[PDB]
Amino acid sequence: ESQYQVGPLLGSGGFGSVYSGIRVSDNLPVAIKHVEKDRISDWGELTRVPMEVVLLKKVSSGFSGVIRLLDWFERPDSFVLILERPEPVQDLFDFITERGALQEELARSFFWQVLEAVRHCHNCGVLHRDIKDENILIDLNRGELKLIDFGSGALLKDTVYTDFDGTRVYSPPEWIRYHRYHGRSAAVWSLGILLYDMVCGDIPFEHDEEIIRGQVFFRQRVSSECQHLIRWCLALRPSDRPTFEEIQNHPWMQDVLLPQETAEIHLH
Ligand SMILES: O=c1cc(O)c2cc(Br)ccc2o1
Predict the structure, then answer these.
(1) Measured distance CA(13)–CA(36) in Å, rounded
(2) CA of 91 to the centre of ligand 1 (A)
(3) 166 is in an annotated binding site
(4) Same domain, 58 and 141
(5) CA–CA separation, 238 vs 18, rounded Å?
(6) How many beta carbons lie within 10 A of that of residue 160, not counting itself?
(7) CATH number, domain at 27?
């Protein structure tokens, strides 16, 4: 209000309207996200808040693969969230629009940081439920990726989920066919979609039928080890998908660049 200077709108959509901001007390770059109360299906508590705020609080202690919630405010018709903002930054969707299919070395660095971020969320008892390139920010100076948009997420549990409101083209075929999925294995499928998107420059599937068929065609030259990983993540049966430990032990994942080296070699 007077604690923050509001800058340009960055984007708006199913997540709300997000503005560039600066915290007056120390000039910290922030993003200020406004979520309308009547456009929020899911609520939790600590008084009643969006699920998105409960999930963010649970993942927002120190480890930085997740954009942190610095503060939040309630308004009569909305909540307002003050999030971290890397500067300069570009979401991975725009980065891929610009660069096309990514060199494997860069995809490996990005994919690995995504897996550390998602493991962190899961250690904190939070399931994101909408992992995709549009929900990943690149801190271009440090080469660090950051998950954003917990607005479709949930407390992690070990029983079946029967609701979903994240992105359909990343949703697994057990969701498409049965409206049921378990959290980790759905997550792993979306991570196979994401990895394909990074190395091919676009998502493999556009239509329910392709998702259900689960047959993956590579339109770009991609190494056999990368194809094997992506195809393992996109196994039709949830329990044939790798755990995070098996993805990270996969031979395509070895020798990851550090974020800083990644920014130097690939980001300028
Ligand atoms: O939840 C979000 C959504 C965003 O779009 C976003 C953008 C920047 Br930049 C920084 C943090 C952000 O967090």
Answers:
(1) 11
(2) 9
(3) no
(4) no
(5) 35
(6) 12
(7) 3.30.200.20
